[PDB]
Design a protein around this ligand. Structure first.
Ligand SMILES: [Mg+2]
Ligand SMILES: [Mg+2]
Ligand SMILES: [Mg+2]
Ligand SMILES: [Mg+2]
Ligand SMILES: [Mg+2]
Ligand SMILES: [Mg+2]
Ligand SMILES: [Mg+2]
Ligand SMILES: [Mg+2]
Ligand SMILES: [Mg+2]
Ligand SMILES: [Mg+2]
Ligand SMILES: [Mg+2]
Ligand SMILES: [Mg+2]
Ligand SMILES: [Mg+2]
Ligand SMILES: [Zn+2]
Ligand SMILES: [Zn+2]
Lengths: 100, 80, 152, 152
RNA sequence: GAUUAAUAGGGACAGUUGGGGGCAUUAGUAUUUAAUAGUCAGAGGUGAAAUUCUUGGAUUUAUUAAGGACUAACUAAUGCGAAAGCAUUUGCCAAAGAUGUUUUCAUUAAUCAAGAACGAAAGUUAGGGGAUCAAAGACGAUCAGAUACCGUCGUAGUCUUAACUAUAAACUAUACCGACUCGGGAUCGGCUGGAAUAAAUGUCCAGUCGGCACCGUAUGAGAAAUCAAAGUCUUUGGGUUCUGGGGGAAG
């Protein structure tokens, strides 16, 4: 019973692909296989934002607080446990560009 | 409606040269007039390396990948 | 870097140039090619500098760049782009003082020029000077440190 | 298809001979004149193939045999300028030798060792042919040292 | 007196293309350490903690330097390589496919016991090197017991010259050459026309050859999962090597 045709990794036309340590655990995982999400968040709770934006010395800031950029790479055990990815029915299992 | 025996021209022209019925090539031969000394020479369509007109030694064509670049004011006609 | 103390206030000379994390990861997008170009140059001022340049593939085709909208430039085109950028910088470096060079470097002049050189090979977007390092700096005579000060 | 590349080697490079066997109408060269040119080129030390190219690009001669009735090599043979070792084998050995050359110096280069194995393989494989078909002396062998002095 | 000239194969040549290989070069932060400045009482680590480190000043901050690795992000159902595998700059060396040919050779080909070239990791021999991790080991914790999962350390190893070794779930678990059977966009590399502009190593459009795939679909296949081959098989024969014959014993 082959489960995935992909077999989980995006890799074809090559023998080998570089291994990445998982953010959460640090387990080595295939760069194709890895669940990778790029995150641009803000360093600060919106309330906290109000508080700081009051006190910003340079008034020449328009959204003059930096965003935090993360390239997040999960091994599978981690990204499942941690709900980044979750179990779906056989038909949906092949759906490719899902979010909102 | 389609007949293999009487294939349509515009179609065969679109097909790859080996996949036509008569298996006919895409190349031509052209008479080229040197911009300077006004000599006429024959040049293969996809010709390899470079061509210099015999009279004045100036450059007529440049090689590529199946195209020849006719350089400058050199005028040409296909021979057929 | 502080070259001099005068009377309770410390004068400084040029040391380096650089970029915020933000302004970098700002510019980094998937589905285009990331070009980087490093150069080593001498001023007539007697400085040895190392300039890192950054550039990105500019999409023309008018869609939203995506998995479908792939923008990559051929590796060879990248190489020609390096060669060209690099060359131009070394030239514009040898003919200028470090005052001149730094002024030009901070501002948008070189980005304009670089786009104009580069465009043949490939259209580029947000050309940037990622960093500048000063490899070898001469000591300043009282004269040149006075001429650096020269403020209007 | 492409010899000794298993898995994916397989594609079609072009040549497609037209239907008309008769030489073209615009062509004014006597077959004799052609044989003259081809032999001049030959004595200049060209290849039957290289001669073919020259006649085709420069001289408006599309197919030499459809003009003369004799293919290029046969012409060369009759008229006595002959390429002693077949152009075919000649190039294969030139190659195997260039690989010898580069390989004596970089002894850690594995790909080139393997490529050499392949090329020599083809050389022997061609030797057998040209031997059984009497185009090569019967005791003729390709060795490193023997073939290196062999006109290549 | 020389059959064509295989949408057979070898060779020539032309513009390319590639994270293929070998030498040199070269960068980049990062870990670790040192130096020089600072400042102080806690750093570490965990589920809590304890081993550790700390006033001889740690962690922390700034600037340099040493030393081994490693090439992030761009990075993809993209590329190359026979496979193993391959990702910084530049230069050199030989090599390669595809495409383009109204070039040349003319069956030179397919597959393959012998016999050979490779072949991750771990491991072995003789030198180097030693920053990071880290089998063994030493300890902390956890536990009824932990010679385990966790933590602090740490040797061989990890890297490198010469050599051995030949093995993997070395995986599409799918032999190679060749035909033929559906549809659709897209993608990487050539080429051919066409179009727009700010006129080009860039766009777009339409062809086509070759790659990696994908999405539909089969009145084709299958025990099914599924498969555009795993189809053209009792309507059973295109060519060729290899392997299996209930389970264990037993590689
Ligand atoms: Mg593997
Ligand atoms: Mg495109
Ligand atoms: Mg074929
Ligand atoms: Mg360093
Ligand atoms: Mg690529
Ligand atoms: Mg040792
Ligand atoms: Mg207890
Ligand atoms: Mg440790
Ligand atoms: Mg065009
Ligand atoms: Mg069956
Ligand atoms: Mg059925
Ligand atoms: Mg399907
Ligand atoms: Mg059968
Ligand atoms: Zn993990
Ligand atoms: Zn002329």
């Amino acid at each position: 019973p082959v489960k995935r045709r992909n077999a989980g990794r995006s890799q074809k036309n090559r023998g080998h692909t570089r291994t990445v340590p998982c953010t959460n655990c640090g387990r080595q995982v295939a760069k194709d296989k890895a669940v990778k999400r790029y995150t641009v968040r803000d360093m600060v709770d919106p309330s906290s934002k109000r508080d700081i934006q009051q006190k910003l010395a340079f008034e020449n800031e328009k959204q003059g607080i930096p965003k935090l950029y993360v390239k997040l790479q999960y091994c599978i055990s981690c990204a499942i446990h941690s709900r980044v990815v979750r179990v779906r029915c056989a038909e949906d299992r092949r759906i490719r560009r899902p979010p909102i | 409606e389609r007949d293999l025996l009487n294939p349509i021209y515009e179609e065969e022209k679109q097909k790859n040269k080996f996949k036509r019925l008569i298996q006919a090539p895409n190349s031509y031969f052209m008479d080229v007039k040197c911009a300077q000394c006004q000599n006429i020479q024959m040049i293969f369509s996809n010709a390899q390396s470079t061509i210099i007109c015999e009279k004045c030694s100036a450059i007529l064509c440049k090689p590529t990948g199946g195209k020849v670049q006719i350089q400058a004011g050199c005028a040409f006609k296909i021979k057929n | 870097v502080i070259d001099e103390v005068d009377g309770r206030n410390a004068k400084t000379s040029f040391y380096g140039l650089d970029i915020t994390r933000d302004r970098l990861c700002s510019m980094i997008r998937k589905w285009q090619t990331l070009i980087e170009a490093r150069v080593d140059c001498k001023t007539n001022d007697g400085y040895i500098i190392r300039v890192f340049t950054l550039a990105f593939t500019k999409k023309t085709s008018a869609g939203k760049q995506s998995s479908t909208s792939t923008c990559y430039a051929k590796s060879s085109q990248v190489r020609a782009i390096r060669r060209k950028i690099n060359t131009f910088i070394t030239n514009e470096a040898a003919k200028l003082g470090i005052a001149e060079f730094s002024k030009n470097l901070i501002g948008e002049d070189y980005t304009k020029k670089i786009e104009k050189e580069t465009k043949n090979i490939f259209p580029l977007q947000n050309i940037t000077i990622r960093k500048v390092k000063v490899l070898k700096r001469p000591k300043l005579d009282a004269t040149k440190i006075a001429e650096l000060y020269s403020h209007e | 298809g492409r010899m000794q590349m298993k898995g994916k080697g397989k594609g079609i490079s072009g040549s497609a001979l037209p239907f008309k066997r008769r030489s073209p109408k615009w062509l004014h060269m006597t077959p004799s004149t052609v044989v003259d040119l081809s032999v001049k080129l030959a004595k200049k030390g060209l290849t039957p193939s290289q001669i073919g190219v020259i006649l085709r690009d420069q001289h408006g001669i599309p197919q030499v045999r459809f003009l003369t009735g004799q293919k290029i090599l046969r012409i060369l043979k009759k008229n006595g300028c002959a390429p002693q070792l077949p152009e075919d084998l000649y190039f294969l050995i030139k190659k195997a030798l260039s690989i010898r050359k580069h390989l004596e110096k970089n002894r850690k280069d594995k790909d080139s060792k393997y490529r050499l194995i392949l090329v020599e393989s083809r050389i022997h494989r061609l030797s057998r042919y040209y031997k059984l078909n009497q185009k090569l002396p019967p005791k003729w062998k390709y060795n490193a040292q023997t073939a290196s002095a062999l006109v290549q």
